[PDB]
């Protein structure tokens, strides 16, 4: 639990809607919300803290 920089998570791409190794990079309490690495792809996009996905 408690979500911070550094670790393995899991995010859903908007391109084909499917599960993709993630990594937390940047993080901002203020408007509660991060910034997701594609592990593989490079692509970093900003997603919700509530719609992290646990590792595999």
Do not use: H, M
């Not at 995010?11 to 593989?40: L, N, Q």
Request: aromatic share 10%; glycine share 8%; with cysteine.
């Amino acid at each position: 639990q408690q979500w911070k920089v550094g670790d393995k998570c899991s995010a859903i791409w908007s391109e084909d809607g499917c599960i993709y190794p993630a990594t937390i990079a940047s993080i901002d309490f203020k408007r509660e919300t991060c910034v997701v690495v594609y592990t593989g792809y490079g692509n970093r996009e900003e997603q919700n803290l509530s719609d992290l996905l646990s590792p595999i």
